[PDB]
Design an enzyme around this catalytic site. Structure first.
Site, PDB file in Angstrom:
ATOM      1  N   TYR A 116       1.240  -1.552  -0.272  1.00  0.00           N
ATOM      2  CA  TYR A 116       0.254   0.282  -0.315  1.00  0.00           C
ATOM      3  C   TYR A 116       1.108   0.903  -0.075  1.00  0.00           C
ATOM      4  O   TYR A 116       1.753   1.570   0.759  1.00  0.00           O
ATOM      5  CB  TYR A 116      -0.480  -0.244   1.184  1.00  0.00           C
ATOM      6  CG  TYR A 116      -1.709   1.159   1.381  1.00  0.00           C
ATOM      7  CD1 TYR A 116      -1.486   3.057   1.724  1.00  0.00           C
ATOM      8  CD2 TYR A 116      -3.360   1.528   0.818  1.00  0.00           C
ATOM      9  CE1 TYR A 116      -2.389   3.796   2.368  1.00  0.00           C
ATOM     10  CE2 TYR A 116      -3.838   2.005   1.083  1.00  0.00           C
ATOM     11  CZ  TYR A 116      -3.345   3.403   2.016  1.00  0.00           C
ATOM     12  OH  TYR A 116      -3.793   4.384   1.747  1.00  0.00           O
ATOM     13  N   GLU A 204      -3.745   7.137  -4.089  1.00  0.00           N
ATOM     14  CA  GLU A 204      -3.621   5.982  -3.564  1.00  0.00           C
ATOM     15  C   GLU A 204      -3.604   4.366  -4.395  1.00  0.00           C
ATOM     16  O   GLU A 204      -4.009   4.653  -5.385  1.00  0.00           O
ATOM     17  CB  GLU A 204      -4.551   5.936  -2.475  1.00  0.00           C
ATOM     18  CG  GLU A 204      -5.292   4.901  -1.657  1.00  0.00           C
ATOM     19  CD  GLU A 204      -6.480   4.142  -0.931  1.00  0.00           C
ATOM     20  OE1 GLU A 204      -7.333   3.459  -1.308  1.00  0.00           O
ATOM     21  OE2 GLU A 204      -6.359   4.247   0.633  1.00  0.00           O
TER      22      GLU A 204
END
Ligand SMILES: CC(C)(COP(=O)(O)OP(=O)(O)OC[C@H]1O[C@@H](n2cnc3c(N)ncnc32)[C@H](O)[C@@H]1OP(=O)(O)O)[C@@H](O)C(=O)NCCC(=O)NCCS
Lengths: 393, 308
Positions: A116, A204
């Site tokens: 991530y 993101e």
């Protein structure tokens, strides 16, 4: 605002970020030719809608699934024929589904590792921050709760820019090693500069990962934009797909009104966002269900009140309206006459409760009481909330 | 450090103000209003119009010249979003002690750059942007808030909202307590003054005998303020604090009007802010209509009313 998968993927690619090779097609033949041009061994066909759950969705052509894998360009074209122009329904769409006008035809890449990586402005450190975790492919909030030791942050100085030392350290904390660490560091750098260039509030990447063939790739991403920067991001905001927004919210935005639909039956609008939230809240505290948030903005302008009524008298779930205007200097009798004008011209059919504060309130309440309309005045916000709640069954 | 400029928040009868964006529509309207309230507005800036007159006051090309000629110690900014960050930086570079930025819509990235400069100096204190301003009732009003509803008194008020603050003002005037100083820190996520900045002023101001903190969803400033109050509002001479937090009914992931009012990544909800503040001794009013009666009762408990 909202971008389709292919629009964010192109924005990323145009700024040096490594993504899967892809084309967009709006006919079955364009999908077939795109699949040929990929010259890839494995191809993925993905319907372009904003709602989630494409993989398990169904088209009103009968085709099951909005994401299909194949090695055969002919199959890409055949399946695209049963997507394009049809509505795709998923667990996150209305029952009618969403019309699919475009499909993405991309190289299907295997994922050897998932991490991530996000970039956003840190509200507590007053600068950009890199937020990364080697635990990729899962909700970052869950990772934070279960394993907060696996959340890594790098604060960046807006004028210094991202430093190689920062990019490399994050890449290492994400688990990249050797040449893939250097690749990941470079990709982080490109993502940071992208974030700044486009006035994102967040970029993101999940999963930010590696292929078995040894490339670092941004496999999927979500970009949130700062609405305040639209004036210097016209090309990006021109891509805003509003086709899956609540229709009343789209109509509200046309007039610089901030409307947010809620699951309730007592509508309200207010001048000022804090007080608008507070009015929703006080309806709830007194046993009601607010139907929406609606901030008229600063200055009590009759045109804003008029448009507000136009928005609400449309919504069939509205059973009552609480108007709360704390106007300070504006003459409340003028506002009152504007309210009765709107209720007549727009054909108000639901009980209306009006809390007016400012000058000339007594005459304003007289005007509302004599209008022949279902309008009640309120002496304060608590009285208004109780009256609104009691106006509905 | 920048915290040394907190005292600049306490405007008073000697504060002299220049209006940046003086000749624009809102700069003109609120400047007219300020002169009626008796505000010591002494001039303003519009690049290229230096030497002109406006509302009987001098217009200047730069803040530096306006400050030198008028002696101004505060500026209020009604400059459009594309240029407002530059206007703030101009005021900072000119070392204006207090800068109040009304402008809504400044890009967040602009404000991150502004804060970078702001935090590395201490001559200038910034309130805002996207805020209504500051008012010392009867002494100095800087901004767009309606002066007539205020009454000089003993409640200090700090708020992230505009009109919701006027509700608290109206209620504290109605119950007879009035306000010592009211500061609208505004609805943006990156700004020049937070709750703690104002709480420090309030806790050390003898004219401030109680505090109202008005917050909302988004960020962590309310939680930071709770921690500050646990540490610094606990000894003898503690002051009663009442609060209301807007957005109990707000859905996640939506901007609720204000740029900074959003629940994101499961953070920023109102419930958590209410509990944090309660755990610091704050009396959180669940209803926005009961801020005045709630703080009044806290005065009653402490026998802080004249009939005691
Ligand atoms: C800031 C705001 C009021 C400006 O709108 P406006 O007054 O209608 O805009 P105008 O174009 O008429 O006026 C702006 C003026 O600033 C001037 N200006 C531009 N850059 C400037 C600078 N760096 N310094 C000084 N003045 C500047 C412009 O030249 C213009 O004046 P002019 O027309 O005489 O040349 C508006 O953008 C806004 O933010 N409104 C909402 C405010 C709000 O609700 N805040 C939250 C309260 S809680």
């Amino acid at each position: 605002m909202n971008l389709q998968e292919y629009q964010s993927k192109k924005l990323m690619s145009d700024n040096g970020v490594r993504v899967q090779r892809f084309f967009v097609a709006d006919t079955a033949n364009e999908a077939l030719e795109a699949a040929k041009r990929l010259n890839a061994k494995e191809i993925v066909l993905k319907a372009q809608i904003l709602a989630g759950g494409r993989g398990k969705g169904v088209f009103n052509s009968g085709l099951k699934g909005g994401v299909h894998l194949t090695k055969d360009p002919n199959v890409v074209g055949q399946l695209a024929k049963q997507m394009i122009g049809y509505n795709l329904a998923t667990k996150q769409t209305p029952k009618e589904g969403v019309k699919v006008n475009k499909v993405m035809v991309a190289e299907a890449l295997d994922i050897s590792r998932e991490t991530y990586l996000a970039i956003l402005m840190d509200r507590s450190c007053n600068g950009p921050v890199l937020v990364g975790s080697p635990q990729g492919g899962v909700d970052i909030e869950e990772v934070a709760a279960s394993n907060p030791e696996l959340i890594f942050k790098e604060q960046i100085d807006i004028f210094e820019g991202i430093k190689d030392s920062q990019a490399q350290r994050m890449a290492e904390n994400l688990g990249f090693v050797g040449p893939l660490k250097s690749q990941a560091a470079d990709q982080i750098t490109k993502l940071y500069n992208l974030f700044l260039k486009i006035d994102a509030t967040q970029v993101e990447v999940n999963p930010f990962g590696e292929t078995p063939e040894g490339q670092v790739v941004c496999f999927d991403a979500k970009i949130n934009f700062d609405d305040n920067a639209e004036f210097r991001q016209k090309d990006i905001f021109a891509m805003d797909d509003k086709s899956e927004n609540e229709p009343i919210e789209n109509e509200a935005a046309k007039y610089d009104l901030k409307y947010i639909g809620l699951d309730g039956n007592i509508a309200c609008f207010v001048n000022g966002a804090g007080l608008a939230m507070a009015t929703c809240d006080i309806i709830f505290l007194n046993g009601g269900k607010p139907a929406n948030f609606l901030d008229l903005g600063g200055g009590v302008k009759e045109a804003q009140v008029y448009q507000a009524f136009k928005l609400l008298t449309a919504d069939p779930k509205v059973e009552a309206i609480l108007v709360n205007i704390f106007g300070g200097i504006v003459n409340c009798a003028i506002i009152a006459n504007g309210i009765t004008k709107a209720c007549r011209e727009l054909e108000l059919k639901v009980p209306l409760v009006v809390r007016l504060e400012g000058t000339n309130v007594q005459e304003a309440q007289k005007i509302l009481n004599n209008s022949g309309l279902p309008i009640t005045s309120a002496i304060d916000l608590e009285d208004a909330a109780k009256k609104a709640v009691a106006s509905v069954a | 450090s920048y915290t040394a400029s907190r005292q600049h928040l306490y405007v008073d009868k000697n504060t002299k103000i220049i209006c940046q964006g003086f000749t624009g529509k809102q700069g003109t309207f609120h400047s007219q209003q300020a002169l009626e309230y008796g505000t010591k507005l002494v001039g303003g800036t519009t690049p290229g119009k230096g030497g002109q007159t406006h509302l009987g006051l001098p217009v200047f090309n730069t803040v530096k010249e306006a400050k030198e000629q008028t002696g101004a110690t505060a500026s209020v900014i009604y400059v459009p979003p594309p240029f407002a960050a530059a206007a703030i930086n101009e005021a900072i570079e000119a070392e204006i002690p207090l800068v109040v930025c009304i402008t809504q819509g400044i890009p967040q990235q602009d404000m991150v750059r502004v804060k970078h400069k702001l935090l590395r100096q201490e001559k200038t204190r910034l309130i805002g942007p996207n805020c209504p301003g500051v008012i010392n009732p009867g002494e100095c009003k800087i901004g767009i808030m309606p002066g007539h509803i205020h009454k000089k008194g003993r409640i200090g008020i700090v708020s992230r909202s505009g009109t919701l603050t006027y509700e608290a003002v109206h209620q504290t005037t109605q119950v007879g307590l009035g306000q010592s100083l009211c500061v609208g820190i505004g609805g943006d996520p990156f700004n020049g003054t937070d709750f703690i900045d104002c709480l420090e002023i309030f806790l050390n101001d003898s004219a401030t005998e109680g505090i109202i903190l008005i917050g909302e969803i988004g960020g962590n400033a309310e939680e930071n303020a709770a921690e500050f109050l646990k540490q610094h509002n606990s000894g003898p001479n503690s002051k009663p604090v009442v609060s209301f937090i807007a957005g109990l009914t707000a859905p996640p992931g939506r901007r609720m009007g204000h740029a900074g009012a959003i629940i994101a990544g499961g953070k920023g909800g109102a419930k958590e802010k209410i509990s944090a503040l309660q755990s610091a001794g704050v009396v959180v009013s669940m209803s926005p209509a009961q801020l005045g009666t709630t703080i009044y009762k806290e005065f009653e408990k402490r026998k802080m009313l004249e009939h005691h």
